[PDB]
Design a protein around this nucleic acid. Structure first.
Lengths: 98, 95
DNA sequence: ACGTAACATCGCGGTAACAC
DNA sequence: GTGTTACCGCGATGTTACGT
């Protein structure tokens, strides 16, 4: 274990650069990974688009986060759709399972 | 050593008895990838660990060497080196 | 033995556009 | 406002030829 993370059945191993949902590997884009990992690296806390952009993207079209969130939730599936929660007029946040 | 035996002193590598004729840069890349199997490495990492030079804007010789590496493994074992888009390459263990 | 030269392929991902 | 899905430029890899 070098930089590996675990929330629920989601595991994000930055070492091998894989994300996996109880055996089923998630084939994500680069930013879907740098986004899903950041949100899970700070579970429970809601971030805003400007925050998420300045960190995951780096130092307009802010809706690219919404697109990346949708693509993430669609790849997660219904069983894990909930893992990325929306806060109206604020932003998004990883939510912890039971 | 999932069918692949790499020889340290002789600077060689074989896959089930069929000696892979590698150049030495391709041998170094495969060894370092197989020595840290499963881990992905960026091109900056590979360039300063496996090569001496810090080309710092150019190269593409890591990409070229992986292709030469992949060809000598053939369409059976070419999956042993995986591609991580926007990041780098990694050794892959069957199965 | 290597590392550009040079192009073909194909995926990344950001904007558009609309429903709600 | 956010969910959502096209659309498609651009750029990251593949790939081989060739100069040294």
């Amino acid at each position: 274990m070098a930089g590996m993370l675990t929330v629920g059945d989601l595991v994000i191993e930055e070492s091998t650069y894989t994300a996996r949902l109880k055996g089923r590997a998630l084939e994500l884009t680069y930013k879907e990974f740098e986004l899903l990992k950041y949100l899970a690296q700070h579970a429970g806390r809601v971030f805003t688009r400007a925050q998420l952009l300045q960190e995951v993207w780096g130092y307009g079209g802010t809706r690219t986060v919404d697109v990346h969130v949708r693509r993430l939730r669609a790849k997660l599936g219904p069983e894990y759709d909930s893992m990325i929660g929306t806060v109206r007029n604020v932003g998004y946040k990883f939510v912890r399972p039971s």
